[PDB]
Amino acid sequence: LKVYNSIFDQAYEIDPIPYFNFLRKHDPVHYEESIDAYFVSKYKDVKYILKNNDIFNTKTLAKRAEPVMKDRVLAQMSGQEHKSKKKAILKGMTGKYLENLMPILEKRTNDIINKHIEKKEIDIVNDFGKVFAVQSSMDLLGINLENYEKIREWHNGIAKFITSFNLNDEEIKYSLECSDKLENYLMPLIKDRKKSTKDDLISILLEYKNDENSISDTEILALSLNVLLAATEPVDKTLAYLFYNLLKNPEQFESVKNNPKLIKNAIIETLRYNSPVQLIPRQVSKPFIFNNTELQAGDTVICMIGSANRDPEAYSNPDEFNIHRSSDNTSHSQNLSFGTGVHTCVGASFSLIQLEMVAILLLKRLKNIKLKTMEITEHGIYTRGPKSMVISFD
Numbered sequence: 001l002k003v004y005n006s007i008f009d010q011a012y013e014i015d016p017i018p019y020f021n022f023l024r025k026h027d028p029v030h031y032e033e034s035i036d037a038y039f040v041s042k043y044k045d046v047k048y049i050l051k052n053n054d055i056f057n058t059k060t061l062a063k064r065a066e067p068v069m070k071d072r073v074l075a076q077m078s079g080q081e082h083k084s085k086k087k088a089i090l091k092g093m094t095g096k097y098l099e100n101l102m103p104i105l106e107k108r109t110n111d112i113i114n115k116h117i118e119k120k121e122i123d124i125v126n127d128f129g130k131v132f133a134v135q136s137s138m139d140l141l142g143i144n145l146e147n148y149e150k151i152r153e154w155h156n157g158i159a160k161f162i163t164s165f166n167l168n169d170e171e172i173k174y175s176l177e178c179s180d181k182l183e184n185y186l187m188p189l190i191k192d193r194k195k196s197t198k199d200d201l202i203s204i205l206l207e208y209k210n211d212e213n214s215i216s217d218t219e220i221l222a223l224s225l226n227v228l229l230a231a232t233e234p235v236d237k238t239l240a241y242l243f244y245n246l247l248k249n250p251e252q253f254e255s256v257k258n259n260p261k262l263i264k265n266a267i268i269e270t271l272r273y274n275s276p277v278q279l280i281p282r283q284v285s286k287p288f289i290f291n292n293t294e295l296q297a298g299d300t301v302i303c304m305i306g307s308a309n310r311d312p313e314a315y316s317n318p319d320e321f322n323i324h325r326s327s328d329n330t331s332h333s334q335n336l337s338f339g340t341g342v343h344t345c346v347g348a349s350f351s352l353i354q355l356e357m358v359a360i361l362l363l364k365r366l367k368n369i370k371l372k373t374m375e376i377t378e379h380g381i382y383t384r385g386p387k388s389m390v391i392s393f394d
């Protein structure tokens with residue numbers, strides 16, 4: 001082997017930060033033969049890749065996502081189609097749809113809190129976040145909460161297919177079974193929704209028109225599964241990371257309590273510091289070179305969002321959690337936790353709003369919060385988060 005530091009070394013998933021530092025400095029466009037892809041670790045190169053959709057396109061997501069999405073996902077689209085359908089999805093989490101949704105998500109949040117408040121402790125990952133995330137996503141889409149437990153199971157199986165690189169044949173078949181079950185559950189709901197429209201995102205997709213042409217039913221399912229997958233996975237992770245980092249920095253935690261407005265900045269810093277979506281793949285459409293590393297048409301580049309967001313060329317003291325960062329005082333950049341360019345996260349504004357509502361309610365109702373999980377264990381290299389994050393309260 002010419003190089004000996006691999007993304008797939010056991011040590012990387014345990015703690016990738018030393019890998020970030022090594023790759024940015026000594027191998028910014030790093031080849032991994034096991035998946036025939038290059039890993040891009042620097043902020044400047046990640047930004048360039050994401051801002052140039054013509055040179056680095058999203059056709060990678062066709063083999064990595066479509067087998068379980070059952071049809072085309074928003075990432076695969078381009079031009080006016082991508083723009084119009086992205087705008088249709090944003091409609092479901094803005095305007096009056098957002099005004100109606102937020103009280104519901106408040107209800108979801110207080111219902112979970114009410115289930116745990118007498119135990120004087122709660123696992124932000126396993127008690128709150130995993131439950132809230134999938135319920136919030138079902139509410140956004142318009143899915144009734146009766147079967148949220150199975151929805152979570154099937155979601156986990158589909159997400160594993162998207163976030164994994166070396167799945168065995170029994171893992172693949174299970175993920176596909178999960179995909180079939182979710183489709184078998186959702187297709188009827190789309191059918192009933194179109195004969196009796198409501199004010200949810202599934203109804204938006206059914207009523208969308210592009211020159212009198214309606215979206216096919218399987219595409220509505222794929223877009224619905226895209227939103228379910230996309231909206232669930234990062235929520236539990238980011239909420240856990242947020243309270244963990246605050247509790248591990250008590251002065252910053254006290255600052256958030258005194259000035260509640262700082263919560264938004266704490267969420268943004270959390271997303272930068274512990275990027276829950278770690279990797280964004282792209283396919284190279286033509287010969288290209290970064291530094292002196294040559295890329296050919298058809299090659300795969302994988303942006304390392306966490307590494308970029310800790311690039312010393314973009315942030316001063318990048319490996320320190322600091323909610324008071326700002327371009328008004330040092331080095332500070334716009335983080336890439338939501339991506340950038342054409343395919344930047346449609347859910348970004350909603351996510352920030354939803355996460356602020358939950359954080360404020362947790363701080364309001366759980367008094368004198370204390371950390372019990374003194375040391376987190378993180379899992380995942382594509383999406384990443386703590387396994388557990390238990391807090392205690394009065």
Ligand code: HEM
Nearest residue numbers: 074075230231234277337338339342343344345346347351
């Ligand atoms: C903390 C929460 C979230 C984070 C960190 C996050 C992160 C990201 C990133 C990094 C991308 C770019 C992917 C790429 O360029 O290939 C993306 C895209 C996307 N996200 Fe999110 N996301 C979050 C929440 C959400 C939510 C709540 C929704 C929907 C309700 C959503 C739906 C989407 C969609 C549809 C895209 C594709 C955008 C496009 O192709 O134009 N995400 N997200």
Ligand SMILES: c1ccc2c3c([nH]c2c1)CNCC3
Nearest residue numbers: 162163229230231233234383
């Ligand atoms: C794989 C697993 C999860 C995700 C999410 C996005 N892409 C993914 C790929 C973008 N939206 C946020 C969630």
